[model samples]
Target: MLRIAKEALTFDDVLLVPAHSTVLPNTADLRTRLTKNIALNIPMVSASMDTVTEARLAIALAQEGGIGFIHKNMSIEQQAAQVHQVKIFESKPNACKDEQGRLRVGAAVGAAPGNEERVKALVEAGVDVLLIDSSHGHSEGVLQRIRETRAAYPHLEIIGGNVATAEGARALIEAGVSAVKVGIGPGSICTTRIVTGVGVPQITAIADAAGVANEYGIPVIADGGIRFSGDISKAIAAGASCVMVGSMFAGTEEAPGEVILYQGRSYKAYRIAYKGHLKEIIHQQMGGLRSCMGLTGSATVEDLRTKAQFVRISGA
Candidate 1:
């Protein structure tokens, strides 16, 4: 028996229409919630990859109104060390704050055996959120891990995802995940969709999952496949509170690796491609969103969502 499902689209396949307004773009507010307890001045999250986010990048994101999710590809102690560095760096003046009075730093963990100890250590080390970074977030195995994490540390928040369907979104939300990450196999360097014949288009994936997660009062993260500044605005308008961006920031100087020159051109060691002055990149992106809201008549990121309209397109 063959079952036909639904259609999905990406950045170019969708566009935001101009909505009438009196709100100026510079006056537009970008502040919003990341999870139930975390707020962001800019709704952006660095992807949780080994070479992507370490303490330096996490500290960079927290300094500004966004957050950096520490990747857990290292030993448990190493992961905790990364979280510790963010906290120490954030302990200085001009750091972001929450009710618990600490900067928000997310740490990634998997559904594999004995990983619960890693989750506990991260929480103890003062990570604000736990990001379960598995490929399929809707499975029973992943579900048990979510349940275990929740049961172990009820106060610590968890953002479980890489899911596209509403059911997948709802199930994880119900299991006590504080936020949902919406996307599967859509990353630019990924081959999961082509290899396993799985996944949905990025835009539609965020819309569907966000629709379900909003009711739970936790935000949905539109992860991966945003290739341009326009797509950042497009993702926000599509209902994501924040975006998990990778390829966009992958090779920048502030990112993990060094750049090399080839044929009079500069290139980085990343598949796509910042820390100290890397904050400038976030500012540049936020500046673009400010411009976008000005054109769209949105007073805030939330207003941008409500006042926005969409028109589907076939090509760039």
Candidate 2:
């Protein structure tokens, strides 16, 4: 008596539902379960944003049992100082070590320490993890920098990324990175795909990068396009040793910024700010865009959570 449908629905058509809780015992707190880590806390990390993961946030996250991946967009000295600050705040006693068990102190002996010097200062200041931050790590310059960092520190943990291919991952691994960051243009507020016509899907990027890490005995971190706690679970299940989140933590109570009142509501807003090197501050520095157009709004992290949205597109 029932008629069959002719068209088949795509996987995206179905929404996942959590099972009803009746007999399963609730034994652990989210915080406790999240405190787990590969080398550090698993559930939390600071986005490498100029406005977000500064000395303050890095120190705070470390104290809260999480690690902050400092961005290298600024001068090396500034980056090193931030890393040093985090280690000091965390009070970690051991030296930073990479997956290959090499250290990174004094890695660039003759070089200006440019960013590496900042790393050195951090070491002197007692920071342990050294993330060699980059957007596209497949370039020869990146490889040279990694080698130099390895030769210099030889004992510090160095993380690198923004590459999506296994070849890119392997190149980084062979260059001696402790962890490889995956995801190329899948940021919530990013327009790299629109502007440059480049980038890979978040899910596919992580899977491919992780495969390369496995071969080299290194770990891979899923670095973008995550929106919720469930996304965190998905990233882990997809082979990420850790996940890097930006927007999720952007407007949190603990995040650095100010609240502004507009129209009939209050909003927490981050201004365009920067330090070190050229020291030029754009109109909108932190959220991945260049300017805010002066459209002010007020919203807490929770408010933002309720209003967050996403979209998907395929290449032509």
Candidate 3:
């Protein structure tokens, strides 16, 4: 016997129904939480993938009202340097910072051992948050690292994830993460779903994680599989506090590489982000979500969550 659910849907498989409203998209407040303690002017975050986020992009994302997580594929010194650059960029005359006179930035780490030196360097560089970017979270190794990182920097906010269920989320929340990163194998470049045959549809995945974490005041970052600005609204309405974007921020001129023509066409790329774009494609997503809010009469991100109603459909 072999049967896969015929009803499971992804972003493209549904639509956010429009409702009666008399509001302006620009007037819709975009402020939302990235963690229990971290708030953003916009509810978008750049993913921590090497091809996507680095210092410049991180700075740009934050400057645009969103935040970016520095990828961990680099060495200790290198990662710390990236963090340091974002700090200086945030300190620039036109740059912005929180009430504490600090810019918000995050770094990625594995759930395994040997995080002491690198994470320590990142912390010293004033990295505000740490994300456990392990292939599998809710495991013993991840739990231990979470405990260690928390004990070492009790003041820092730690985000853990890539889980598909509320159980996985509960484990991380109990382990003390300020927030949980949900969705597995939903990335445009990620193949874990096809490669390992393990994954969850991003929409359902976000709802599951949020259902459990929301009760604890732990926000959820709906990471990956977002292929459109409109999808940003769906993810947030599905219960995510913020959406982690990658393919959407990649390819932009400010993303740290020169544009190369592919098949006689230009392609400046990260893992997800589009071409030389707004402060970020994310800034655009914020605008779109604001439009979504206006259509639904939502004055706040939380209100959007309640006002949003979904309708299953074909490609949009």
Could you tell me every candidate's TM-score relative to the true structure?
Answer: 0.90, 0.64, 0.89
For residues 198-263, write the lDDT of model 3, one tens digit per residue: 778888888888899989989988988887788888998888998887766778766756676676
Model 1 accuracy (lDDT, Cα): 0.80
lDDT for residue 212 in candidate 2, whole number 0-100: 70
TM-score quality measure for candidate 1: 0.90
Q: Which stretches of candidate 3 lie over 4 Å from their true place?
A: 1-7, 90-96, 187-190, 260-265, 269-274, 278-280, 314-316
Candidate with better lDDT, 2 vs 3: 3
- For residues 88-198, could you state the per-residue lDDT of candidate 1 as single tens digits? 663344356666666778889888878877987898898888888888999888988898888888888788987988899999988889988888876545698778888
lDDT of 1 at 148: 82
Give the TM-score (vs. native) of candidate 3: 0.89
Candidate scoring better on TM-score of 2 and 3: 3
Deviation (Å) of 135 in candidate 2: 1.8
Lowest-sum lDDT 10-residue window in model 1:
268-277
Q: lDDT of each prediction vs. the true structure?
A: 0.80, 0.52, 0.80
Candidate 2 stretches with Cα past 4 Å from truth are 1-38, 71-85, 90-113, 187-190, 269-316
Q: Candidates ranked by lDDT, best first?
A: 3, 1, 2
lDDT of 2 at 193: 78
